[PDB]
Amino acid sequence: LPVVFEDVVLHQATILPKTGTVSLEVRLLEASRAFEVSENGNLVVSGKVYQWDDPDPRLFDHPESPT
């Protein structure tokens, strides 16, 4: 699955506890191509995610270095 992200925003950081576990819940709106990762009902990450219809290798050619 070649994937594409767009307009990702990180609102707060999740501090992994030394002991125990923390549950991250991810929700998708395939209609709008949006996702939201929430921790205990508090927004953590929000953006757009959708499959890449036509991957193009040319995107990964290394640009000429200015120096």
| Positions that interact with its own copies (CB under 8 A) | 27, 29-32, 34, 36, 38, 41-43, 46
| Cβ at position 1, least distance to its own copies in Å | 18
Cα–Cα nearest to 27, from 16, 40, 18, 36: 36
Cα–Cα nearest to 40, from 23, 16, 17, 18: 23
| Cβ at position 16, least distance to its own copies in Å | 20
Helices (H) and strands (E) in the chain, counts: 0, 4
| Cβ at position 18, least distance to its own copies in Å | 26
Identity of the residue, 27 or 58, whose beta carbon is nearer to its own copies in the bound complex? 27
